[PDB]
Scaffold this active site. Structure first.
Site, mmCIF file in Angstrom:
data_model
loop_
_atom_site.group_PDB
_atom_site.id
_atom_site.type_symbol
_atom_site.label_atom_id
_atom_site.label_comp_id
_atom_site.label_asym_id
_atom_site.label_seq_id
_atom_site.Cartn_x
_atom_site.Cartn_y
_atom_site.Cartn_z
ATOM 1 N N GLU A 191 16.825 17.396 13.881
ATOM 2 C CA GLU A 191 17.844 17.860 14.821
ATOM 3 C C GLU A 191 19.222 17.875 14.177
ATOM 4 O OE1 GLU A 191 18.049 15.599 18.380
ATOM 5 O OE2 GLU A 191 19.621 16.836 19.274
ATOM 6 N N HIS A 192 19.536 16.839 13.395
ATOM 7 C CA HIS A 192 20.772 16.852 12.613
ATOM 8 C C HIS A 192 20.801 18.021 11.634
ATOM 9 C CE1 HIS A 192 22.580 13.079 13.967
ATOM 10 N NE2 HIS A 192 21.380 12.530 13.919
ATOM 11 N N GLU A 202 26.224 7.161 13.639
ATOM 12 C CA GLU A 202 25.881 7.416 15.033
ATOM 13 C C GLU A 202 25.044 6.290 15.623
ATOM 14 O OE1 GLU A 202 27.445 9.754 16.916
ATOM 15 O OE2 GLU A 202 28.395 9.721 14.936
#
Ligand SMILES: CCCCCCCCCCCCCCCCCC(=O)OC[C@H](COP(=O)([O-])OCC[N+](C)(C)C)OC(=O)CCCCCCCCCCCCCCCCC
Ligand SMILES: CCCCCCCCCCCCCCCCCC(=O)OC[C@H](COP(=O)([O-])OCC[N+](C)(C)C)OC(=O)CCCCCCCCCCCCCCCCC
Ligand code: HEM
Ligand code: HEM
Lengths: 52, 445, 420, 102, 32, 55, 53, 78, 302, 55
Positions: free
Chosen positions: B59-60, B136
């Site tokens: 996803e990153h 994150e």
């Protein structure tokens, strides 16, 4: 007085009828078991033996 | 117009299947914008403790560069057309969605195809996103509700693939390499586990032609004839505590095993969750709130907030409540929340049922208002139901829900059940598991 | 059959709009010109207490009746307040929209405002201000408005700590009776009939019919205020005077805002088309978040740059952003960049409109501001009609205008206005 | 007719005795939940006057005395300050009971 | 980070119907 | 130093119940009869203890 | 009521002849009727007299 | 586009204060909580000033100086 | 850790009155650094000051070359003996500072108080200048405070000019505060909320008249006599004498006798007083205000 | 609605003494002897009451 006279309280009471009746049945059988009530215990077939 | 004919006047959605099995679903509305996304049935339930951060790390890396557009050309194209590019990952589903105008649908579909089937993973970009994902994780454990949700998932599904978080542990983050990401990509991005959902100002025939142009022949082949299967996950009634008294507030989540996605009792449990409800300190209702737990919390200054949640996964899930309260009212809120649960189990009333039905109808339609949320609903519904449930069918089920069957399902899912407890912060006031179970049943039924 | 807006002007000053799309949920909004800008120094926080007083006792419905009735039908009542406007929105099924609309009309027009109720509500006011000021962005914005304006828009959106506990029912009644007049009110609705909304407005909107107390015109003062709070993440807003809303210069300023960057379009992105982000990333390797801040109210507007940066690199981040805007003002920009900015602006406008809450807010705001509805294609036409030379003029006006800075964080390296 | 009723009410008000201690009817009202809510809803000046009258009555009945004859609360000046607050509190309570009933 | 918090193995104490994680509960909760 | 009367547990119970108890200032002689009843109970306990001592 | 309690004490003291039977019967009936019936009705009467409602 | 939400992209929830007077059907994101803010200490009330003769002498004309001590009160001189 | 609560309590007691808050805000908006630092601990810094930071501050500033050990009623032999017995083991000059650049500006704390405080100042000379002496004479000319309890202050020009057109309680004075490298001179006004603008405008016009040259030599001589009396009454107390001795030792490193101090005070000329007033009028302004400011003017309105 | 166990005064005392008493989790079998002494005291009281009923 008039606080507990309504459809919501009536349906709450009707929901609690089986539980209250079951608790009354528990109280009755516990009472006759604790006091050895002859008038009720001369009908169940097994416990009839000990009284003779 | 009445509610029934309004809901039947809500337009239906069109679902088609390509040759490869990739599903294509669309809903046409009168808006000048649209939301087009790809929903993929891949996540942490599929990850197997060695590639635990693979889906989120992909996803990153999805928007950081593709084969056709290297580097940031994809970002330049999306910003030039003015679209909003978003993605999310959850233990069942990974979604890559674009919000744009109705005139840029071919460009949106081409960019989505380039994102999904043509992902390029540079080693330097992997290192940069590894630094970003570590930061994150720090910023995420600085939060508190996500920590409690992760702890609840771990303690409720321990030993199963459902317990591991979406982000994955830091050791797996630091050991993830490009070969394992490509293995995850070539194992979990097959055609039958993807739906292309477009909502808003879209034409179904145009979307189908664009799907046959771009999304045709994605993988179609596992290259080992090894199709993964989702085994059922064992629910563990358990308790996790994370005591750290420097935190000002305590977060406690208490849940039980959910019904699952396909279970018809989900609507009834959502009615019960609407009856119990949610509350935070900024509400202006005060003591006059219809929710008894919220009213007692306002009157006695118990909690800063609480909410009821119903998360569903493939034949499983978590159904319960999460509350933020001070260090001296956790016992009171557990007692009152358990009392509310047993009140719904034993003596729920038709007025509360009607209120919860209206709240669920309003919440459902308000959540199904908006092109991006209805695209999300279409994608998730084609992923987990095999179809999109119409709002008329939802209203029919809600009308079928009444008081006695609510009490039956609440007793099925709450009465005398071993819960999963997740506590974080100054949780000395939080009682033990035996006391929580003793609150989870009643001595008067 | 999705019909257009039925729009009319009820002769006591009232604006009535309705769109019957046969949506399963109906939504009624009532928009008043009773923001915080209409307060003076003696009644600060009255707007905040009035915003939080939407569930109190009314002349026709008690607080318990309002809360329990709205939750029993399942609808919701919300109050959205900006410095010029206050919108009361109610949401619910078509079968109950009569009583939800009646409740909203009661709350907006006939409030009891009992003294014990507002005395109880002051604590919730303090709680609301704390929860709002949890994040430092809004603290910077209220500080910025306070340091930028003199009287009207310098009034904060939240009640000051000295006024906390001094607002009374007399001031609340004075504010309501002076600003809740039908000449400043727009009653708009989605999913409801124009005839029924018109007849309820005529039936229960005939008690306050004045023009209302005209507020003071906002004046610009400029200057800087700083909040040393020891956070390593320094926030800094540097703005200047711009045009009022509903102007061609306002359109040019919005185009300039979307040219300089008005938020991210890709999550965890680098903002490659944002000129401010490119200029900052060309000089600093530290994490940052820089965007263009635009806020135009009915009297005047503020345009500038909002920077979130490290404590050490705050000076270079702010200087790089200011130099980027200086280059834009001198004319270092491309027609493709302006076209992309226009596309971003029109796309963002359409995604704001497409939801029913945003559509309601747009209809009500247009009804209050212009007195007539503007269809979206004409807004597209105006945005396209914005020229690049107007963007250059707007940026030149920003760089030549007097400035206002609101800063917070660890300010050992945050510059002042004399160094910018 | 009703003038005789007013005179008989005057005689009963004299016979009750709370005028002798400087009290009023609302001062002598027993504090139930509705009454306490009404007292909390009272303004500051009426609260202070009521509380001082109660304190003076307690002092007088501790001394087992009464006020002088010219200091008694007359029936004409015996104002009913707690009547609207008590009525609205009972009205809200009855609305709450009816809502819980339905 | 908080994700590294993993529940250890309790298989030395689990009941005979609970020892496996591939088999769902609620077919044995009534029996237990 | 500290206040023994309100810090010692038995002493603070006795102080909070009988010594520093907020009592109404105007209670008449009719309020003495509770303590009269308690002292009656103590007196009867002692005298009956002697009677059962010799009974 | 206190007077009736004194009557009941004296009646319990004296044996069962005329007219102690009817005096004790009237005393008990008056006692029960006062303590169940007359005090609440008189309280309602005083409330209406002092204009409570 | 005559509104704050349609004009300011990410600054709409900052420029607009939304208060839900009645709890909605859907839950709100970012509920928030007050983390037990501390109370300032209770001090003696400083006298007001109603006449000019007692008002004179309290306009500062010297630099601020503080004074603490082991057994003398902490004074401030203007 | 136990003492930071005492820091909070002491700051609250110091801010019990509003003049402390006004002067702190005035310095904060007058200087960029090295004098904008609050004399009391910030509310966020309560709970954050460490013993490491305290030791760093002591080791960097409590050094021998920047201290003076003075004494009254003590032998010089004993004083120097204990000087080399304790104070011999510190480093040197230590850290210098930041030179305290001026910035100007204004802040306004609206707190709903019954009276409005407002200080409007500008830059002046530093300690050790004839310009600073002229500024102090100008302060005593415009009124440094009352010499008479419950008086009218008939000689102070600020009070005369304000009382010419006011019917409300007021207190106007000339605020003067010099330092090692910079000074602050201005007007301090306490007034009503409605009359604050009139009081500030009257005081500013009085100082503008002084700058233009509306003054008399008799008033300047009276101001010099007031300054001489104030300095001598500061010296006459042994506490004030010790404070002045220590301040002179830190500043100049030598003793200046009170006779020479009064000599230079008399050597102050009235033309330098006019020059100081003109400098304050023409200088960039720093304003700290507090109260109910519905009618308190802004710096651009002055 | 309120907690009767933590609100009613006798129930509050019983809750703070015997129900929600914070007890150490590691006390051995030797700590049961206080409760055993109390139970034997109650047994002795009842049994001697019957003995003196017949004595
Ligand atoms: C000492 C050993 C027993 C301790 C008490 C106990 O286990 O109670 C069980 C439980 C409470 O302990 P529990 O925690 O096992 O309760 C679980 C209850 N169910 C199975 C319904 C979820 O007590 C009862 O359920 C009631 C006991 C009394 C029954 C009625 C009286 C019978 C005799 C009448 C004369
Ligand atoms: C409790 C009320 C009922 C008690 C009862 O009848 O118990 C039956 C049992 C057994 O009943 P039983 O049928 O053996 O006869 C008892 C009644 N007499 C001897 C008068 C005929 O009685 C008792 O336990 C006595 C309780 C006395 C109190
Ligand atoms: C620990 C407390 C008590 C003990 C040990 C006790 C013991 C005795 C004894 C041994 C007798 C027989 C002697 C006699 O009859 O004269 C007796 C008689 C009596 N007791 Fe008690 N007693 C106690 C408390 C009370 C109380 C609390 C009451 C009343 C409520 C009471 C009322 C009587 C009466 C009326 C008699 C009858 C005496 C008579 O008629 O002459 N006793 N008591
Ligand atoms: C209210 C409490 C008590 C009462 C009423 C009571 C009463 C009596 C009576 C009447 C007897 C004589 C009956 C007989 O021995 O056959 C007796 C004997 C005895 N009691 Fe108690 N008693 C009480 C408590 C206790 C306690 C607390 C203890 C010891 C800790 C105790 C120890 C004994 C012993 C050792 C005997 C003699 C038994 C023997 O000789 O075999 N009693 N008690």
């Amino acid at each position: 007085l008039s606080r507990f006279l309504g459809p919501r309280y009536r349906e709450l009471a009707r929901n609690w009828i089986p539980t209250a009746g079951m608790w009354g049945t528990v109280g009755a059988v516990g009472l006759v078991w604790a006091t050895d009530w002859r008038l009720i215990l001369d009908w169940v077939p097994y416990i009839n033996g000990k009284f003779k | 117009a009445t509610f029934a004919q309004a809901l039947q006047s809500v337009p239906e959605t069109q679902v088609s299947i390509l040759d490869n099995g990739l599903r294509v679903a669309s809903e046409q509305s009168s808006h000048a914008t649209c939301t087009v996304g790809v929903w993929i049935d891949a996540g942490s339930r599929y990850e197997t403790e060695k590639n635990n951060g693979a889906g989120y790390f992909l996803e990153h890396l999805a928007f950081k560069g593709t084969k056709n557009r290297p580097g940031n050309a994809l970002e330049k194209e999306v910003e030039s057309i003015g679209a909003h590019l978003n993605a999310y990952s959850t233990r069942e589903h990974t979604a890559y969605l674009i919000k744009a105008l109705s005139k840029d649908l071919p460009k949106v579909v081409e960019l989505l195809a380039d994102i999904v089937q043509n992902s390029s993973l540079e080693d330097s970009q992997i290192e940069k996103e590894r630094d970003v994902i570590l930061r994150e994780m720090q910023e995420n454990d600085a939060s508190m509700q996500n920590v409690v949700f992760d702890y609840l998932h771990a303690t409720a599904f321990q030993g199963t693939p459902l317990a591991q978080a979406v982000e994955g542990p830091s050791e797996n983050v630091r050991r993830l390499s490009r070969t394992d990401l490509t293995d995850y990509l070539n194992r979990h991005y097959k055609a039958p586990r993807m739906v292309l959902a477009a909502a808003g100002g879209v034409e179904h025939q145009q979307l189908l032609d664009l799907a046959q142009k771009h999304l045709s022949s994605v993988s179609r082949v596992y290259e080992e004839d090894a199709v993964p299967g989702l085994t059922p996950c064992r629910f563990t009634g358990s308790e996790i505590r994370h005591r750290d008294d420097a935190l000002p507030l305590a977060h406690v989540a208490i849940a039980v095993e959910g019904p699952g996605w396909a279970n018809p009792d989900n609507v009834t449990l959502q009615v019960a969750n609407a009856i119990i409800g949610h509350y935070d300190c900024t509400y202006g209702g005060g003591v006059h709130l219809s929710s008894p737990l919220a009213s007692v919390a306002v009157a006695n200054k118990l909690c800063q907030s609480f909410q009821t949640f119903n998360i569903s996964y493939s034949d499983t899930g978590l159904l319960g409540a999460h509350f933020v309260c001070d260090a001296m009212s956790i016992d009171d809120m557990v007692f009152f929340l358990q009392g509310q649960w047993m009140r719904l189990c034993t003596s729920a009333t038709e007025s509360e049922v009607t209120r919860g039905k209206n709240i669920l109808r309003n919440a459902l339609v308000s959540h199904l208002d908006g092109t991006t949320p209805v695209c999300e609903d279409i994608g998730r519904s084609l992923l987990t139901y095999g179809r999109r449930i119409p709002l008329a069918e939802w209203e029919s089920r809600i009308q079928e829900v009444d008081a006695q069957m609510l009490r039956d399902i609440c007793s099925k899912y709450f009465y005398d059940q071993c819960p999963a407890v997740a506590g974080y912060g100054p949780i000395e006031q939080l009682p033990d598991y035996n006391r929580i179970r003793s609150g989870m049943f009643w001595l008067r039924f | 059959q999705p019909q257009d807006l039925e729009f009319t002007k009820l002769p006591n000053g009232l604006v009535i709009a309705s769109l019957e799309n046969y949506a399963p949920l109906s939504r009624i909004g009532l928009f008043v010109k009773a923001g915080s800008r209409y307060e003076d120094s003696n009644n600060l926080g009255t707007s905040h207490l009035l915003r939080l007083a939407s569930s109190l006792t009314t002349k026709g419905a008690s607080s318990f009746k309002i809360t329990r009735g709205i939750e029993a039908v399942g609808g919701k009542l919300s109050v959205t307040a900006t410095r010029e406007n206050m919108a009361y929105t109610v949401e619910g099924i078509r079968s109950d929209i009569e009583i939800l609309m009646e409740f909203l009309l009661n709350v907006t027009t006939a409030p009891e405002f009992r003294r014990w109720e507002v005395a109880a509500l002051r604590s919730q006011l303090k709680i609301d201000k704390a929860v709002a000021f949890q994040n430092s962005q809004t603290r910077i914005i209220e500080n910025l408005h306070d340091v930028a304006y003199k009287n009207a828009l310098a009034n904060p959106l939240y009640c000051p700590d000295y006024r906390m506990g001094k607002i009374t029912s007399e001031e609340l009644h004075y504010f309501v009776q002076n600003h809740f007049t039908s000449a400043r009110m727009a009653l708009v609705g989605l999913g409801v009939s124009h005839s029924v909304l018109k007849q309820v407005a005529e039936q229960f909107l005939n008690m306050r019919g004045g023009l209302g107390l005209a507020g003071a015109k906002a004046k610009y003062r400029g200057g800087e205020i700083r909040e040393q709070n020891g956070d390593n993440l320094v926030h800094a807003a540097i703005v200047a005077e711009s045009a009022a809303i509903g102007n061609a210069e306002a359109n040019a300023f919005s185009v300039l805002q979307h040219l300089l960057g008005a938020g991210p379009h890709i999550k965890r992105g680098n903002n490659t088309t944002s000129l401010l982000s490119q200029s900052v990333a060309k000089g600093s390797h530290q994490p940052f978040d820089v965007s263009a801040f635009n806020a135009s109210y009915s009297d005047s507007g503020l345009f500038g740059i909002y920077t979130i940066s490290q404590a050490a690199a705050a000076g270079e981040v702010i200087n790089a952003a200011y130099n980027q805007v200086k280059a834009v003002a001198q004319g270092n920009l491309s027609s493709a960049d302006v076209q992309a900015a226009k596309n971003k602006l029109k796309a963002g406008y359409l995604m704001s409109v497409e939801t029913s809450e945003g559509f309601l807010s747009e209809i009500g705001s247009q009804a209050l501001a212009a007195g007539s509805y503007m269809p979206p294609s004409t807004v597209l036409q105006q945005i396209d009609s914005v020229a690049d030379a107007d963007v250059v003029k707007a940026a030149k006006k920003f760089v030549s205008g007097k400035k206002s800075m609101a800063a917070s964080g660890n300010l050992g390296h945050t510059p002042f206005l004399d160094e910018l | 007719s009703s003038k005789w009723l007013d005179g008989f009410r005057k005689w009963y008000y004299n016979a009750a005795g709370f005028n002798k201690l400087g009290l009023m009817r609302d001062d002598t009202l027993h504090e139930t939940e509705d009454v306490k809510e009404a007292i909390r809803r009272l303004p500051e000046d009426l609260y202070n006057d009521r509380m001082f009258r109660i304190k003076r009555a307690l002092d007088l009945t501790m001394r087992h005395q009464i006020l002088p004859k010219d200091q008694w609360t007359k029936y004409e000046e015996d104002k009913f300050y707690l009547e609207p607050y008590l009525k609205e509190v009972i009205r809200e309570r009855k609305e709450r009971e009816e809502w819980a009933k339905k | 980070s908080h994700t590294d918090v993993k529940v250890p193995d309790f298989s030395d104490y689990r009941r005979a119907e609970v020892l496996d994680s591939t088999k769902s509960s609620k077919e044995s909760s009534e029996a237990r | 130093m500290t206040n023994m009367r309100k810090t010692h547990p038995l002493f603070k119970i006795i102080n909070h119940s009988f010594i520093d108890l907020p009592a109404p200032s105007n209670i008449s002689s009719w309020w003495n009869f509770g303590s009269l009843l308690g002292v009656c109970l103590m007196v009867q306990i002692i005298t009956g203890l002697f009677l059962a001592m010799h009974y | 009521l206190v007077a009736n309690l004194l009557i009941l004490t004296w009646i319990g003291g004296q044996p069962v002849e005329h007219p102690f039977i009817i005096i004790g019967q009237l005393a008990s009936i008056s006692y029960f009727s006062i303590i169940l019936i007359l005090m609440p009705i008189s309280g309602i009467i005083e409330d209406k007299m002092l204009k409570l409602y | 586009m005559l509104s704050v939400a349609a004009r300011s992209g990410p600054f709409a929830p900052v420029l607009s204060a939304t208060s839900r007077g009645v709890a909605g059907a859907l839950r709100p994101l970012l509920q928030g909580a007050v983390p037990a803010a501390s109370e300032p200490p209770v001090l003696d009330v400083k006298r007001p000033f109603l006449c000019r003769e007692s008002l004179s002498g309290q306009a500062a004309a010297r630099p601020l100086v503080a004074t603490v001590g082991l057994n003398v009160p902490a004074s401030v001189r203007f």
